[PDB]
Design a protein around this ligand. Structure first.
Ligand code: NAG
Ligand code: P8A
Lengths: 292, 339, 226, 218, 56
């Protein structure tokens, strides 16, 4: 119905369809994601001998995906009880910080991976391709810093919000005000997609401008360039579009009737679960799908 | 038609040598030393690792003090190590990066290197004022330099790919003597402990015993089926071991003028790149193409251990004159001191 | 060879210079050993190859500054607060350190300027008969044993002929320097050391100094004139 | 330990000069030049401008090292592993020696040498840049001599386009590793340009494949 | 041609006219030498760690 969160008119729904769809899906992501991300982490640590600039970046992406996966079972408990948080106040802030930062963290360490491949195909004689293992580790720490330094504000927010006889833990609630967490959610996709699409389009353009597509191992790599651009769109577009529809309703109808949002609210949280597929599909696309 | 008569005479003469060598084969080394107890399993631990080479290491040589060693690698640098503290005493940049051999003078004032440039370069380490500088570039060989060994501070003996070995005089730079008789590229040589004689194994699967003074071959040893890649004299000086490309080793006796024992295993199919004896001569260490060094019991022809610590092909092997360490270089650009 | 230096000044400041010539100056660590008008030698400062570790004497720790210029092959010493205790002949000494190197092998000519715990080396004897053809022995003792764990005692013997710069005779316990005749021998027991001369020539007369090299505030032995 | 600690920083000073020279060498492209002696390698080296000869030339801010080992006259097998790691192999074949003999015609000698170097165990992925020089003299020679002198199985007109393309495909047929390495064929004139550009293009392709190995895509 | 064949025969005769010893006598020295210096082989018989210059 209606609720007031931090002196803002926020409409919150607790739908029955949530318990019968997401906990099934959320369970599948965690069991396969832990198996995938954990195995890819196990191989990287001891089964790999030589570390280069391109391989450490794939290690950071594995770290970001691993941290996101372990928070999913805690989510599954929250949806099963139909928005009934029973874990405290400070732990609630930990996971919403842990979820938003890791989701941005994985996004960051695949635009860098996309940019890294772009400079190895379209500008092969650049000095950027021969950076040392310390320069990459310096870059990774800076990228992790902007990841944490952009999502720290979720820790400062007290979020065991009471909803009647229920405890609500959610950083995504529909209401008629501008907040930074929504702008970050939109910029998590629109800006990285442009870089990923541009890099993945120039790489394929160059690999065919010089007739190197005749090779078989090269021809396999080209498809994997298009795959990561397809998985990224599949995983993140559905959640972004619904948020645009929600943003459209708030500007044309407002919160005076918190009933029109019954469909988009159920749709958004169902589609938002697809953004965790990217944290599970990466090992079968990035790491395990390489000749080395 | 004297050519046919000469060729026919040689065949009869060659048969006479084989008949005489068969008469002296009263028994076998395995039969004679069947009574002696075996040395048992030998385990060697990497006591030190020397890093700094950025390319394949093709040769090494210990100093006579059993503390310093020089290593050659194809990045164009000759590095002298302090094997006790891993420290680098010297780093000599070579004119030609294609270096395939290295030598350390017994006195310790000079080192030598050579390779595809067909030139052996002597470097003065004493350097009464300044740093290491080249002293004498010995030119005259037709093919690539495969080995070089110092008799003294003024005499060096080298082997080349033009099927000839040579004896040089550093002061003048001229070939004092030239040893001919090989039909294939000479790949290695080993000076006798008395310095008076030396052997040389070439690609024609033959080993020849030369005389430094007189300058002509004395004895020829056959029995290998492929190119001989390494040779090494027994500490007694009356025997030597050969490492060929057919993944086998052979111990020849100078006085008996015939093969004594063979060191082969059906597991190893990779040829030997370098051989070396221990101080007592009981152990025969051989480096293989399959990335591991091997320890053979020279008296029983039985495996005794494996020095498996390298990622790539083992190219060089050395044992200290003191006999308390074994240094093993390889193509992964690392040297390891064992035990 | 190496030379260069300053002159007399009243209680002010001055900068000393040394000009290396043809020995690959960039790879040699350089010292600034000094000698008072009639005292013995005394170490001042040190700068390693590549301008790395820099050491100073306890009496010149803050006032003096040693710097080197690998291009142009020039070594500097900046003297700011010059008292009446530091009027001396400043020598420049080259030294290289590897496994078999011989430090302090070559000494500069040295220049004079006038102004108008540690290990002590005794060398109790100060004068001996000057007769030639005999076998003189020069003794020395140390406050603490110079036999280090790696097994070589860092004791150096120098000879300053009257009128010229000191010359290294024996580096470490017994190793003999290059160009020195075999008449000189060195024997030591870690704490007490002796230098033996078999036959005395006309050029063997002079003052003999002994220096330690265990800990870097290294000291000399005031000499034993013949 | 004062002399022992001073020797340690000498090793550290030696350490950093090793890396500085190692970085400089890693930025250089190494090429191996082969041929049949009179195959026009002397012409080619001028186009890009005893023992082993090293040639230095640059193009578009890239430094090339070109090693000529045609003066060795020794067993190739013993020293051919020293060049395992070059960016590309530049092979020079004279199109005008299809009828000249060394017996055996010189063209078959090059095909015998090309087959050995193409199927070498040490060269399984290094690209081979095949240069067919003396195309002007080859053009004039076929007017008075038939290609059947070299290959008895040839059946075609004695024209430049048909005969020259027939020689090229017989050189690419000797490649048995058809799926892991590529052979670049260029018909070179004695007095012509853009020869270094073709070498640069075939070397850049090696760099891209080398780069994609590090990133794991290829 | 003829000179090279004559030289090969001339050298082969010298290697034929050499003094040889029985293997039993030659093999005895190698066994004797290996035993005579058995105690002076650090690789064959490891020495205590206090004597190894590389262990510590
Ligand atoms: C909430 O809505 C009421 C009227 O529906 C309005 O007066 C109030 O200002 C709104 N508050 C916020 C924070 O939007
Ligand atoms: C915490 C209970 C589920 C609601 C939710 C999920 C997220 C997110 O993935 O950022 N934010 N809020």
């Amino acid at each position: 119905h209606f609720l007031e969160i931090d002196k803002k008119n926020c409409c919150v729904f607790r739908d029955d369809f949530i318990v019968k769809v997401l906990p099934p899906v959320l369970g599948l992501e965690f069991i396969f994601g832990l198996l995938g991300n954990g195995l890819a982490l196990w191989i990287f640590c001891f089964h790999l001998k030589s570390w280069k600039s391109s391989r450490i970046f794939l290690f950071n992406l594995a770290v970001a995906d691993f941290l996101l996966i372990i928070c999913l079972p805690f989510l599954m408990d929250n949806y099963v009880r139909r928005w009934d948080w029973k874990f405290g106040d400070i732990p609630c802030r930990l996971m919403l910080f842990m979820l938003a930062m890791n989701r941005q963290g994985s996004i960051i360490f695949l635009t860098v991976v996309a940019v890294d491949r772009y400079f190895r195909v379209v500008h092969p004689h650049h000095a950027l391709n021969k950076i040392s293992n310390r320069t990459a580790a310096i870059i990774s720490c800076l990228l992790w810093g902007i990841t944490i330094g952009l999502t720290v504000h979720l820790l400062k927010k007290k979020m065991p919000i009471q909803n009647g006889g229920a405890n609500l833990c959610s950083s995504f609630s529909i209401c008629h005000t501008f907040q930074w967490h929504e702008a970050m959610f939109l910029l998590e996709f629109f800006l990285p997609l442009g870089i990923i699409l541009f890099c993945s389009a120039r790489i394929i353009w160059s690999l065919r401008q010089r007739q190197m597509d005749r090779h078989a191992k090269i021809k396999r790599a080209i498809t994997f360039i298009m795959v990561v651009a397809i998985v990224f769109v599949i995983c993140f577009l559905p959640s972004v579009v619904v948020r645009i529809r929600i943003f459209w309703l708030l500007h044309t109808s407002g919160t005076q009737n918190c009933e029109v949002y019954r469909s988009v609210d159920l749709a958004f949280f169902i589609t938002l679960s697809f953004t965790y597929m990217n944290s599970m599909l990466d090992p079968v696309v990035y790491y395990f799908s390489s000749p080395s | 038609s004297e050519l046919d008569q000469l060729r026919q005479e040689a065949e009869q003469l060659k048969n006479q040598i084989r008949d005489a060598r068969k008469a002296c084969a009263d028994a076998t080394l395995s039969q004679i030393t069947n009574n002696i107890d075996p040395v048992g399993r030998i385990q060697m631990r990497t006591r030190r690792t020397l890093r700094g080479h950025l390319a394949k290491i093709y040769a090494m040589h210990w100093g006579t003090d059993s503390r310093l060693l020089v290593s050659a690698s194809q990045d164009g640098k000759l590095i002298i190590w302090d094997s006790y503290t891993t420290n680098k005493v010297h780093a000599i940049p070579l004119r030609s990066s294609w270096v395939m051999t290295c030598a350390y003078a017994p006195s310790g004032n000079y080192v030598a290197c050579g390779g595809l440039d067909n030139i052996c370069s002597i470097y003065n380490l004493k350097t009464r004022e300044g740093n290491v500088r080249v002293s004498r570039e010995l030119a005259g060989h037709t093919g690539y330099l495969s080995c070089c060994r110092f008799l003294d501070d003024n005499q060096i003996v080298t082997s080349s790919g033009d099927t000839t070995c040579a004896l040089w005089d550093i002061e003048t730079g001229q070939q004092t003597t030239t040893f001919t008789g090989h039909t294939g590229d000479v790949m290695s040589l080993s000076l006798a402990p008395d310095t008076r004689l030396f052997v040389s194994g070439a690609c024609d699967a033959s080993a020849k015993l030369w005389d430094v003074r007189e300058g002509m071959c004395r004895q020829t040893f056959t029995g290998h089926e492929s190119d001989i890649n390494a040779i090494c004299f027994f500490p007694n000086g009356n025997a030597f071991a050969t490492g060929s490309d057919d993944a086998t080793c052979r111990l020849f006796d100078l006085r008996a003028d015939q093969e004594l024992m063979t060191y082969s295993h059906d597991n190893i199919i990779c040829g030997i790149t370098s051989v070396s004896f221990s101080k007592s001569g009981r152990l025969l260490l051989a480096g293989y193409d399959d990335f591991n060094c091997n320890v053979w019991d020279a008296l029983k022809a039985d495996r005794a251990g494996v020095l498996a610590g390298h990622d790539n092909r083992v190219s060089c092997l050395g044992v200290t004159d003191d006999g308390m360490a074994v240094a093993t270089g390889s193509w992964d650009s690392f040297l390891k001191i064992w035990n | 060879v190496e030379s260069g230096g300053g002159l007399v000044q009243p209680g002010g400041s001055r900068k000393l210079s040394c000009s290396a010539s043809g020995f690959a100056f960039s790879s040699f660590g350089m010292h600034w050993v000094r000698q008072a008008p009639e005292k013995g030698l005394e170490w001042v400062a040190y700068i390693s190859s590549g301008s790395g570790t820099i050491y100073y004497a306890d009496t010149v720790k803050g006032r003096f500054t040693i710097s080197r210029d690998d291009p142009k092959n020039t070594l500097f010493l900046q003297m700011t607060s010059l008292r009446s205790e530091d009027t001396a002949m400043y020598y420049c000494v080259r030294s290289i350190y590897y496994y078999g190197s011989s430090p302090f092998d070559f000494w500069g000519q040295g220049t004079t300027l006038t102004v108008s715990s540690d290990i002590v080396m005794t060398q109790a004897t100060s004068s001996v008969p000057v007769t030639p053809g005999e076998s003189v022995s020069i003794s020395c003792r140390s406050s603490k044993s110079l036999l280090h764990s790696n097994g070589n005692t860092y004791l150096y013997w120098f000879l300053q002929r009257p009128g010229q710069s000191p010359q290294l005779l024996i580096y470490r316990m017994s190793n003999l320097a290059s160009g020195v005749p075999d008449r000189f021998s060195g024997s030591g027991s870690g704490t007490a050391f002796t230098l033996t001369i078999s036959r005395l020539e006309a050029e063997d007369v002079g003052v003999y100094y002994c220096m330690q090299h265990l800990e870097y505030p290294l000291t000399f032995g005031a000499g034993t004139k013949l | 330990s004062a002399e022992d600690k001073a020797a340690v920083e000498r090793s550290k000073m030696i350490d950093r000069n090793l890396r500085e020279d190692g970085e400089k060498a890693a930025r250089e492209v190494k090429l191996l030049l082969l041929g049949a002696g009179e195959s026009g390698k002397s012409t080619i080296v001028k186009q890009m401008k005893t023992g082993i000869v090293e040639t230095h030339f640059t193009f578009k801010d890239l430094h090339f090292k070109m090693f000529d080992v045609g003066a060795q006259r020794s067993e190739r097998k013993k020293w051919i592993h020293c060049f395992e790691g070059v960016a590309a192999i530049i092979f020079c074949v004279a199109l005008s020696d299809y009828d000249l003999v060394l017996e055996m015609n010189r063209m078959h000698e090059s095909m015998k040498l090309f087959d050995s170097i193409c199927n070498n165990k040490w060269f399984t992925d290094t690209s081979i840049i095949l240069f067919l020089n003396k195309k002007d003299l080859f053009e004039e020679k076929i007017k008075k001599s038939p290609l059947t002198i070299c290959y008895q199985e040839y059946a075609g007109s004695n024209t430049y386009e048909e005969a020259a393309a027939y020689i090229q495909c017989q050189f690419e047929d000797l490649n048995k590793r058809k799926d892991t390495k590529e052979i670049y064929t260029h018909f070179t004139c004695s007095t012509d340009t853009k020869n270094v550009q073709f070498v640069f293009d075939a070397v850049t392709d090696v760099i891209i494949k080398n780069n994609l190995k590090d990133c794991g895509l290829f | 041609s003829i000179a090279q064949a004559r030289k090969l025969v001339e050298q082969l005769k010298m290697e034929a006219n050499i003094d040889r010893i029985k293997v039993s006598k030659a093999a005895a020295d190698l066994m004797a030498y290996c035993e005579a210096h058995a105690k002076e082989d650090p690789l064959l018989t490891p020495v205590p760690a206090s004597e190894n210059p590389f262990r510590e």
